[PDB]
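Lab notebook, bench 4. The sequencing result for the construct came back, and we need a structural model before the next group meeting so we can plan mutations. Quick request posted to the team channel:

Model the 3D structure of this chain.
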Amino acid sequence: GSHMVIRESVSRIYVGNLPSHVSSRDVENEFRKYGNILKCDVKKTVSGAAFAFIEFEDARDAADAIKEKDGCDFEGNKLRVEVPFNARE
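Done. Here's the predicted structure in token form:
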């Protein structure tokens, strides 16, 4: 499933609680292979958990990276990777 367009939104991906934490330089180069980045920002909370925010035009190609880091885990296994696109509708 891949249809529909939108020219008034900002499409971004949420990746947090992750081992090592992908820094902005590596998410620009290795995550730009998988889809087309317009910005990549590091936002971090007071609980010691780090997040990276990844602004992509296409989810369906970036889906290789997102499944390859998939397995979001909480409460003693640390590993959150999630699309708010759901492969794009």
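The beta strands are 12-16, 37-44, 50-56, 80-82.
Will bring this to the meeting.
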